[PDB]
Amino acid sequence: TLLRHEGIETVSYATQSLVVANGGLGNGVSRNQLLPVLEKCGLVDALLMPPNKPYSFARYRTTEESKRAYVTLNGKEVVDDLGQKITLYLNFVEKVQWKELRPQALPPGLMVVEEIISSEEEKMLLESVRRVKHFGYKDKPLSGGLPDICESFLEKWLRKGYIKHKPDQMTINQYEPGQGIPAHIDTHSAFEDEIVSLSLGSEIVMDFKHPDGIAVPVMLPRRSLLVMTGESRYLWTHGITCRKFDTVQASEKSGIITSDVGDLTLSKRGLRTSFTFRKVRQTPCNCSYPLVCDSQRKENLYFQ
């Protein structure tokens, strides 16, 4: 979906314009970094770099040079602002155009309970102990169980209705200014459906992405309980992109804030600790999302 959903039509014959994948601004690729490369094949008439996009567009003076770029730059590697290693992929385009999408609701199933605990309770939970610690649990070897300070809050949560499935497994995640968790999807054949995460410490933004291309950055405020179930916990994937700052609604909002709707400002994330509670399931899964399911992808070598 690197460019299919994006509405980027590609052709199989050499043209003056190309499409550099992963060579975009929304990928930490600097113009002072990409251009010096692209010009290693010929005269570059223009270098289009749309904001918040994982790709850019390059046009050469003549298709001869543009053709040389397609053949000597595919597979090439470059360093982003983080200093990581990303692979560049080029392709010929007959028109420079793309699709802009702005989601208007959190992924189906995802819910965000705000101000679940008071400022005092937060301080407590914090002082009760990237770094990671497991509790409850390899669904065969388990431990004494979840701590007492948690068994309560949990009961209080399900007493209300914020969650209707008492967990038994917990994972502690503490992030420091710059850390983050790589996009993933909790194993289907492991933990039950409903999953909740209590985020304390400081604000942070998560990246939920639909398998087709719909990306939705959620805003997880302090003392808030992230509750994801259904399509959001099975199909969509979440993550935390490494960084020390991140765009936010320059106004009030625990949720999805898109661009071109008002004002944007920056915010530095501090120390963030999260309590992710899950419920291990004994039975195999049979959700409506077999493609991202290993419990279902096992009854057929095709997928394996």
Ligand X SMILES: O=C(O)CCC(=O)C(=O)O
Q: Rounded to an integer, what distance in angstroms lies between the CA atom of residue 231 and that of residue 228? A: 9
Indicate the burial class of 283 (C-beta count within 10 angstroms; 0-12, 13-18, 19 or more): exposed
Look at residues 126, 166, 155 and name the one whose alpha carbon lies nearest to residue 274. Answer: 126
Query: Which H or E element spans position 31?
Result: helix 31-38
Q: Is 174 annotated as a binding residue?
A: yes
Q: How far apart are CA 225 and CA 216, in angstroms?
A: 18
Contacts of ligand X in 165-184 (CB under 6 A): 171, 173, 181
The site for ligand X, by CB under 6 A, has a size of 8
Q: How far is the CB of 300 from ligand X (least distance, A)?
A: 27
State yes or no: residue 273 binds ligand X (CB under 6 A): no
- Asked if 193 is part of the footprint of Mn ion (rule: CB under 5 A), the reply reads no
The residue (of 57 and 236) whose beta carbon lies closer to Mn ion is 236
Residue 165, annotated as binding a ligand: no
Q: Which one, 157 or 191, has the nearer CB to Mn ion?
A: 191
Instruction: Work out whether 276 is an interface residue with ligand X (CB under 6 A).
Output: yes
* CB-CB neighbours of 177 under 10 Å: 13
Ranges within 194-213 binding ligand X (CB under 6 A) = 197
Q: Does position 238 bind ligand X by CB under 6 A?
A: yes
Mark the breaks in the chain: residue after which each occurs, C to N over 2.5 Å. Answer: 129, 137, 252
Work out how close the CB of 129 gets to Mn ion at its nearest, in angstroms, rounded to a whole number. 20
Q: 């459906």: which residue's tokens?
A: 193
**Residues, the chain:** 304
Is 45 annotated in a binding site? The answer is: no
Judged by beta carbon, residue 151 or residue 186, the one nearer Mn ion is 186
Asked whether position 287 contacts Zn ion by CB under 5 A, the answer is yes
The nearer residue to Mn ion, 2 or 181, going by C-beta atoms, is 181
209, interface contact from Zn ion, Mn ion, ligand X, none, CB < 5-8 Å by kind:
none
Supply the minimum distance, in Å, between the C-beta of residue 71 and ligand X: 40
Shorter beta-carbon distance to ligand X: residue 68 or 165 = 165
Candidates 188, 223, 238, 269: give the one binding Zn ion (CB under 5 A): 188
Among 25, 154, 228, 293, binds Zn ion (CB under 5 A): 293
Q: Of 27 and 274, which CB lies nearer to ligand X in the complex structure?
A: 274
Torsion of CA 47, 53, 55, 57, to 10 degrees: -30
User: Is residue 186 a known part of a binding site?
Assistant: yes
Binding flag, residue 186, Mn ion (CB under 5 A): yes
- Residue (171 or 249) nearer to ligand X, CB: 171
- Is 134 labeled as ligand-binding? no
Is 91 a residue that touches ligand X (CB under 6 A)?
no
Could you tell me if 178 and 202 are in contact, meaning their C-beta atoms sit under 8 angstroms apart?
no
The set of residues, in sequence order, having a beta carbon less than 8 Å from that of 59 and lying 6+ positions away, is 16, 17, 18, 44, 45, 46, 47, 48, 66, 96
Enclosing H/E stretch for 169: strand 169-175
Q: Taking CB within 5 to 8 Å according to partner kind, which of ligand X, Mn ion, Zn ion, none is near residue 22?
A: none
- 177 token code pair: 């200014």
Residue 304 CA to residue 286 CA, distance in Å, equals: 17
* Residue with the two structure tokens 């914090």: 126
Binding site listing for 2-oxoglutarate = 173-175, 272, 278
Residues that bind Mn ion (CB under 5 A): 186
